[PDB]
Subunit: 271 residues, 2 copies
């Protein structure tokens, strides 16, 4: 029998666009998304175990895979429950995956800076505990080294206060980077505001790129160059893939839809 | 019997915070949110009718009430299905409501501008088809008139391009307003950027307020004064109220948690 439900556990406190894309495909088959909220760290596993034991959904969507995620083992020990992970293939261990390509995106951003003559750049990244942290760092280190570009990074907690603090630090230590890439839009904006208050012109003295795009980047002063992921289409593909698994079709891993570097006013030749 | 599900139909293409708050309360009772997506205008009613006919959820959450919303009539003709609306009480016609107070918020923002000596202000609002459009306009017109303040408004579609266009228009027509209130954060940011490009200093020449708060306002240049709604707690209260209805308890309308005007650098005395 079918419940016509897909399970998703969210963390308490991007996702909206993913849910819109998922819904655009689930509606075609009169499916619904069943959403629960994990308030703690082992809470998600407990909810998933309940769903599996009761057969309360037809498939599970796994987001934000960490290194050694306890969910992979859960799914592998329960192959009668379809699941799909949205992650780099290196983190999913054989489970059906809609694959991101952070290493590719890293290259696209760095080559854009290289073309503009940047030789000293920095990244303001998220927490080191993210499953994509080591993929991104390895890509940035390899590409920058191979292009003879100086590279430094600082970790933050995604808040504008943290992005602001990191930017102040990068702009105060000689030799000052001429471009900074931020792991989210809010920190790129906070960093641009820091540069402006400091009298560091964007983009004349400092280029800025946001990893991730939103209306915020369009509204900024100046508008911020962004690596844009097609989250809507990713969501749609994810739902289609889970429906295939539910239908009993074999599903090879699928690359997520291509990203695009949207060039705006915040990147320009290096000072 | 109980399904332990609450139904929510979202529109294709705030809500994330609401869902976090809802989940914080639903998890206490092992309830889930069942989410579907309306792709058209009469799509929502059809989904709701299906849920009602099959008893597939225990209660329905109604958001974004319009004037003469076809959902009110649906719910009233189906009182065996618990529901809760998040709206001004004037739009819900006796249905259990978690009540917003846009007129109160309007007063708080306008009094803040009055204290700073503003005598000519403007609003960049959303579409006129919003159910809260006439409540807000009536409040702004009454309060401004009664304080002897000149007031004008322009309608937009919530995009930064639309907010930018509206700001250019307001700043180009004499007498230029000394403060602009925007119906969302992205337009307040887009408007602040327009003022900066134009050489209109914020806040020295122009004060800006965002109706709605987010990290974007904290990250702006300068940070943007915002009317902040407690969406997390609103979500939590909404879930608790629907659970009461499901439990068979009588539920009087409830005011939503108090909003707060967070004063930041973008408001100052009038030029």
């Amino acid at each position: 029998s079918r419940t016509r439900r897909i399970g998703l556990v969210l963390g308490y406190d991007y996702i909206m666009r993913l849910i819109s894309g998922l819904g655009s495909a689930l509606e075609e088959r009169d499916y619904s998304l069943l959403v629960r909220m994990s308030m703690d760290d082992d809470d998600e596993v407990s909810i998933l175990e309940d769903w599996i034991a009761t057969g309360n959904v037809d498939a599970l969507l796994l987001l934000n895979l960490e290194i050694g995620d306890p969910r992979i083992e859960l799914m592998k020990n329960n192959p009668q429950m379809p699941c799909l992970a949205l992650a780099d293939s290196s983190l999913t261990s054989g489970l059906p995956t809609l694959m991101s390509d952070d290493a590719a995106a890293s290259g696209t951003m760095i080559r854009h800076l290289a073309l503009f003559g940047h030789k000293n750049i920095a990244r303001v990244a998220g927490p080191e505990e993210l499953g994509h942290s080591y993929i991104r760092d390895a890509a940035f280190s390899e590409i920058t080294t191979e292009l003879g570009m100086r590279y430094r990074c600082l970790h933050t907690d995604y808040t504008p206060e943290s992005g602001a603090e990191a930017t102040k630090r990068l702009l105060s230590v000689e030799p000052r980077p001429t471009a900074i890439i931020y792991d989210n839009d809010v920190m790129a904006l906070a960093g641009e505001s820091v540069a402006s208050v400091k009298g560091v012109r964007v983009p004349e003295d400092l280029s800025i790129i946001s990893w991730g795009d939103s209306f915020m980047n369009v509204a900024a002063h100046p508008p911020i160059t962004a690596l844009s992921r097609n989250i809507l289409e990713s969501g749609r593909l994810a739902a289609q893939l889970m429906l295939k698994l539910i239908d009993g079709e074999d599903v090879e891993n699928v690359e997520e839809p291509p990203y695009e570097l949207i060039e705006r006013a915040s990147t320009a030749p290096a000072a």
